[PDB]
């Protein structure tokens, strides 16, 4: 038989290991020759594996690189203009790689050039709430200061946006051991912790889903008209540079001014964590000086796109995509995902060689330039948006397969909840103590959902990865799955060696997954989801699961508003329309589910009419006018949080209209906008409900 079990059984941990080794011996930075050569290798291999067509889709997009002959660094400068301390020019390379060329030194991609000098203010995580605390409670003014912030909690681009709007002239980002050094584990190469010379790379753009900063809306093809740099989307206006904790220690140790407001502002270094501004008495005349000389450059990038044509519905696409570009070796990010995609393609190809084809078309993607703002996936989706919004069934992401070895993590649309539950009940748990038990059993035990008995946690989708354009712009049902850690307060912080030179094959093989069993389990989940989406006669989406969550999100947004009962009375702010819409959605989804179970099965038009209702249900949550000042975030139920791109927010338009509303100067206008957002959300939920009604 060619069934899901045949597909799953063909996947091998040993192949995933071999591929991961193959993908991680040299750097594959976006826009470099080494990453083009890897694209060509993957293209050739996917052809050999059996795909019907495998093409490169290239674009010319804005990238950012340090200047090789004018390196980035930070100094402490004395009154004479002597630089008495300098931060490192590179991370000490790991054992056996000290002679590898073309390791890009740590930098913040898309930082502008400059050499700002001034006094430091320490801003904790540079979160919205941290800047509120500084400014409103502590009366500390960031204007004209260099801010030093610890990485963690939220996306670094939000930190830099928050610093900019506070008036900062520069941002120094550093990794505090509190957030990146797990107790009782050795630093790399002797364990998986971050050494004091390690540094987290990463872009600091605020693109809000636009893709290439020069061509918002349209693919960056050969005849593209480009914005001038001054009109580009998302570029930071102040210099930014990341450092490790040995260097941070030298910068923080002299800090004066005000004490930290409380212990949530103190990291683990042996410094006071004084907020500043500036240094203590003896060193009051010293300043900090940045030297940033990186350049932005339009550069060719290459996606690999493989097609396995459907036998019955070739005009319906199930997409498995993940990126290929890395900051350095990409041992976890992204090659632990790319190796899993490679083995999934090989397995599907084995079935294809035996005469099988999936019911629907499967597209496989190796995206480029994800590290520079999801550029490859976004430009391709812009090029192909008409095909995707009329034919796109689902997108399954495949960045890193592991960020820990504790349990499964799944973030996806409610439409995929039942698919994931059913699939995980059929897979073996790889966990110690759960031999002979299902993955569903181990996952549910280790990661219980807050609301339900005997149910696992599934998170919402925001941004930070290549599902963003498919889900948030185009409204295609999307999902992701990986193995994760236990550490809840570190959820959005990354694993310790994230985006460092230390992220290697050895890191994974020695410390995370020696048997490649967690990688194999993740391959089974991602591959199984793709298999069911591409082969099930009826699409495996349960609209009733959306009805359940919409009521939870309505209760939640109502509770936020109800912090302000007087204003709700004054401005007649009613959530009645939203609850009515959710009630109607619940009722109509229940009836649709009855018809889906009961319709005449011999009738392919009723089936496909029904399959189209399922497919276009996620699409119905798209508003073609987008969210306020964010035209490329169009999903009305989910958006990336306006305070943290990594986090999904529910009913974001209402949430943002309510956020900090007590501080708005014109409460009538602010509450008017809350009421407008309630109307848009109620309307969108009712309109989505009506797509599931009988069609005529």
Ligand X SMILES: *[C@@H]1O[C@H](CO)[C@@H](O)[C@H](O)[C@H]1NC(C)=O
Ligand Y SMILES: *[C@@H]1O[C@H](CO)[C@@H](O[C@@H]2O[C@H](CO)[C@@H](O)[C@H](O)[C@H]2NC(C)=O)[C@H](O)[C@H]1NC(C)=O
Ligand Z SMILES: *[C@@H]1O[C@H](CO)[C@@H](O[C@@H]2O[C@H](CO)[C@@H](O[C@@H]3O[C@H](CO)[C@@H](O)[C@H](O[C@H]4O[C@H](CO)[C@@H](O)[C@H](O)[C@@H]4O)[C@@H]3O)[C@H](O)[C@H]2NC(C)=O)[C@H](O)[C@H]1NC(C)=O
3-state SS, residue 416? helix
Assess contact for 668 and 566: CB atoms under 8 A. Answer: no
> Would you list the DSSP string of 168-208?
-SEEEEE--HHHH--TT-PBTTSSSBPPTT----EE----T
- Give the C-alpha distances (Å, rounded to integers) separating 345 from 49, 54, 341, 491: 7, 12, 6, 30
Going by C-alpha positions, the residue among 284, 295, 269, 280 that lies closest to residue 174 is 269
Please say which residue, 374 or 661, places its beta carbon nearer to ligand SDR: 374
What radius of gyration do the chain's Cα atoms show?
Answer: 25
Report in angstroms how near the CB of residue 421 gets to ligand Y at its nearest.
7
**Residue 472 interacts with ligand SDR (CB under 6 A): yes or no:** no
- Give the C-alpha distances (Å, rounded to integers) separating 228 from 161, 204, 213, 218, 345: 21, 19, 10, 15, 40
Distance of alpha carbon 362 from alpha carbon 349, whole angstroms? 11
Assess contact for 293 and 72: CB atoms under 8 A. Answer: yes
Question: What share of residues in the chain are helix, strand, coil (percent, to 5)?
Answer: 40, 20, 40
Assess contact for 334 and 341: CB atoms under 8 A. Answer: no
**Residue 399 interacts with Cl ion (CB under 5 A): yes or no:** yes
**Residue 384 interacts with Ca ion (CB under 5 A): yes or no:** no
Distance of alpha carbon 276 from alpha carbon 264, whole angstroms? 16
Site pattern 617..646 for ligand SDR (x: CB under 6 A): ----------------------------x-
Please say which residue, 59 or 646, places its beta carbon nearer to ligand Z: 59
Distance of alpha carbon 530 from alpha carbon 512, whole angstroms? 25
670 binds, among ligand Z, Cl ion, Zn ion, none (CB under 5 to 8 A by kind): none
263 binds, among ligand Y, Zn ion, Cl ion, none (CB under 5 to 8 A by kind): none
Distance of alpha carbon 499 from alpha carbon 484, whole angstroms? 17
3-state SS, residue 598? helix
682 binds, among Cl ion, ligand Y, ligand Z, none (CB under 5 to 8 A by kind): ligand Z
358 binds, among ligand X, its own copies, ligand Z, none (CB under 5 to 8 A by kind): none
Distance of alpha carbon 534 from alpha carbon 448, whole angstroms? 29
Report in angstroms how near the CB of residue 223 gets to ligand Z at its nearest.
6
Binding residue (CB under 6 A) for ligand SDR from 463, 524, 642, 686: 463
3-state SS, residue 83? strand
41 binds, among ligand Y, ligand Z, Cl ion, none (CB under 5 to 8 A by kind): ligand Y
Please say which residue, 239 or 306, places its beta carbon nearer to ligand X: 239
Going by C-alpha positions, the residue among 44, 227, 153, 143 that lies closest to residue 492 is 153
Label residue 228 exposed, middle or buried (CB < 10 Å: 0-12, 13-18, 19+). exposed
542 binds, among ligand SDR, ligand Y, ligand X, none (CB under 5 to 8 A by kind): ligand Y
User: Which 403-442 residues touch ligand SDR, going by CB under 6 A?
Assistant: 403
**Residue 343 interacts with ligand Y (CB under 6 A): yes or no:** no
**Residue 223 interacts with its own copies (CB under 8 A): yes or no:** yes
Binding residue (CB under 8 A) for its own copies from 79, 270, 625, 666: 625
Please say which residue, 393 or 408, places its beta carbon nearer to ligand X: 408
Report in angstroms how near the CB of residue 624 gets to its own copies at its nearest.
6
Site pattern 342..371 for ligand SDR (x: CB under 6 A): -----------------------------x
Report in angstroms how near the CB of residue 312 gets to its own copies at its nearest.
6
Please say which residue, 485 or 675, places its beta carbon nearer to ligand X: 485
Number of residues that bind ligand Y (CB under 6 A): 15
Please say which residue, 61 or 134, places its beta carbon nearer to ligand Z: 61
Assess contact for 157 and 110: CB atoms under 8 A. Answer: no
**Residue 374 interacts with ligand SDR (CB under 6 A): yes or no:** yes
Please say which residue, 374 or 529, places its beta carbon nearer to ligand SDR: 374
Going by C-alpha positions, the residue among 140, 89, 146, 142 that lies closest to residue 117 is 146
Q: What is the 3-state secondary structure (H, E, C) of 641-691?
A: ECCEEEEEEECHHHHHHHCCHHHCCCHHHHHHHHHHHHHHHHHHHHHHHHH
147-159 CB burial, b ≥16 within 10 A, e <16: bbbbbbbbbbbbb
Binding residue (CB under 8 A) for its own copies from 261, 620, 664, 667: 620
Applying CB under 8 A, the span of 98-106, 261-269, 309-317, 504-512 interacting with its own copies comes to 309-317
Please say which residue, 258 or 385, places its beta carbon nearer to ligand X: 258
- Give the C-alpha distances (Å, rounded to integers) separating 359 from 346, 415, 534: 18, 20, 6
333 binds, among Zn ion, Cl ion, ligand Z, none (CB under 5 to 8 A by kind): Zn ion
Binding residue (CB under 8 A) for its own copies from 624, 629, 665, 666: 624
Residue 645: phi and psi, rounded to 5, are: -55, -25
397 binds, among Ca ion, its own copies, Cl ion, none (CB under 5 to 8 A by kind): Cl ion
584 binds, among ligand X, its own copies, ligand Z, none (CB under 5 to 8 A by kind): ligand Z
> Would you list the DSSP string of 275-286?
-BSSB-GGGTT-
464 binds, among ligand X, ligand SDR, Ca ion, none (CB under 5 to 8 A by kind): ligand SDR
Site pattern 593..612 for ligand Y (x: CB under 6 A): ----x---------------
Region class of 621: left (phi > 0), else alpha (psi between -120 and 50), else beta:
alpha
Residues in touch with ligand SDR (CB under 6 A): 155, 202-203, 333, 371, 373-374, 399-400, 403, 463-465, 645
Residues in touch with Cl ion (CB under 5 A): 397, 399, 480
Residues in touch with Zn ion (CB under 5 A): 333-334, 399
Residues in touch with its own copies (CB under 8 A): 52, 217-219, 221, 223-225, 307, 309-310, 312-315, 317, 361, 383-387, 390-391, 576-577, 604-605, 608-609, 612-613, 616, 619-620, 623-625, 631, 672, 675-676, 678-680, 682-683, 687-688, 690-691, 695-696
Residues in touch with ligand Y (CB under 6 A): 22, 25, 41, 44-45, 83-86, 418-419, 422, 540, 542, 597
């Amino acid at each position: 038989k060619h069934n899901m079990k045949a597909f799953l059984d063909e996947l091998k941990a040993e192949n995933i290991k071999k591929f991961l080794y193959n993908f991680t011996q040299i750097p594959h930075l976006a826009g470099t020759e080494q990453n083009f050569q890897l694209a060509k290798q993957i293209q050739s291999q996917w052809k050999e594996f059996g795909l019907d067509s495998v093409e490169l889709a290239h674009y010319d997009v804005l990238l950012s690189y340090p200047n090789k002959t004018h390196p980035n660094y930070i100094s402490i400068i004395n009154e004479d203009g002597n630089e008495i301390f300098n931060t490192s020019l590179f991370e000490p390379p790991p054992p056996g790689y000290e002679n590898v060329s073309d390791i890009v030194p740590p930098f913040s991609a898309f930082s502008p050039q400059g050499m700002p000098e001034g006094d430091l203010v320490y801003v904790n995580y540079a979160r919205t709430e941290d800047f509120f605390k500084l400014e409103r409670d502590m009366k500390i003014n960031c204007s004209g200061k260099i801010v030093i912030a610890r990485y963690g909690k939220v996306f670094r681009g939000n930190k830099v946006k928050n610093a900019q709007l506070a008036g900062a002239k520069g941002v120094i980002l550093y990794s505090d051991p509190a957030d990146y050094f797990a107790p009782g584990v050795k630093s790399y190469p002797d364990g998986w912790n971050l050494p004091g010379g390690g540094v987290q790379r990463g872009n600091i753009l605020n693109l809000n889903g636009a893709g290439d900063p020069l061509t918002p809306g349209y693919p960056a093809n050969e005849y593209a008209y480009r914005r001038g740099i001054a009109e580009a989307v998302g570029l930071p206006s102040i210099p930014v540079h990341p450092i490790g904790y040995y260097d941070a220690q030298k910068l923080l140790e002299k800090m004066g001014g005000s004490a930290p407001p409380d212990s949530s502002w103190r990291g683990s270094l042996k410094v006071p964590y004084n907020v500043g501004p500036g240094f203590t008495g003896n060193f009051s005349t010293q300043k900090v000086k940045m030297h940033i000389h990186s350049t932005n450059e339009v550069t060719r990038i290459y996606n690999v796109i493989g097609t396995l044509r459907g036998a019955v519905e070739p005009d319906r696409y199930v997409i498995l995509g993940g990126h290929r570009d890395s900051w350095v070796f990409g041992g976890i990010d992204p090659q632990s995902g790319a190796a899993v995609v490679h083995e999934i393609v090989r397995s599907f190809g084995t079935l294809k060689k035996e005469g099988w084809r999936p019911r629907r078309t499967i597209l496989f993607a190796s995206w480029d330039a994800a590290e520079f703002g999801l550029l490859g996936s976004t430009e391709w989706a812009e090029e192909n948006s008409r095909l995707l919004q009329e034919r796109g069934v689902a997108y399954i992401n495949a960045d890193s397969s592991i960020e820990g070895n504790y349990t499964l993590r799944v973030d996806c649309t409610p439409l995929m909840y039942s698919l994931v539950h059913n699939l995980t009940k059929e897979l073996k748990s790889p966990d110690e103590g759960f031999e002979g038990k299902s993955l569903y059993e181990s996952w549910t035990k280790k990661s219980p959902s807050p609301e339900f008995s005997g149910m696992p946690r599934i998170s919402k989708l925001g941004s930070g990865n290549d599902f963003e354009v498919f889900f948030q712009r185009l409204g295609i049902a999307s999902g992701r799955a990986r193995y994760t850690k236990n550490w809840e307060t570190n959820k959005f912080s990354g694993y310790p060696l994230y985006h460092s030179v230390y992220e290697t094959y050895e890191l994974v093989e020695k410390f995370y997954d020696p048997m490649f069993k967690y990688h194999l389990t993740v391959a089974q989940v991602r591959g199984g989801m793709v298999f069911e989406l591409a082969n099930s006669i009826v699409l495996p989406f349960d609209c009733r699961d959306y009805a359940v969550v919409l009521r939870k999100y309505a209760d939640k947004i109502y509770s936020i508003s109800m912090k302000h009962p007087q204003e709700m009375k004054t401005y007649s702010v009613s959530f009645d329309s939203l609850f009515s819409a959710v009630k109607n959605f619940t009722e109509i989804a229940s009836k649709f589910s009855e018809r889906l179970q009961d319709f005449d099965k011999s009738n392919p038009i009723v089936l496909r009419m029904m399959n189209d209702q399922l497919m276009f249900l996620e699409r119905a949550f798209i508003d073609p006018l987008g969210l306020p000042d964010r035209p490329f975030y169009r999903h009305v139920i989910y958006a990336p949080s306006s305070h943290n791109k990594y986090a999904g927010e529910s009913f974001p338009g209402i949430y943002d209209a309510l956020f900090d509303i007590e501080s708005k100067v014109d409460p009538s206008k602010a509450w008017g906008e809350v009421k407008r957002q309630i109307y848009v959300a109620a309307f969108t939920v009712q309109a989505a409900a009506e797509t599931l009604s009988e069609v005529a």
